[PDB]
């Protein structure tokens, strides 16, 4: 399934989801 950023950084915010592969935020 698509997690959160696969083509957008939404930590900044709140629109990341249960599944951060992107690590340019700090999710985790
Ligand atoms: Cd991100
Ligand atoms: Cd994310
Ligand atoms: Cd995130």
């Given at each position: 399934?698509?997690?959160?950023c696969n083509d957008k ?20």
């Open positions: 399934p698509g997690p959160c950084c939404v930590c900044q915010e709140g629109g990341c989801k249960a599944g951060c592969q992107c690590t340019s935020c700090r999710c985790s």
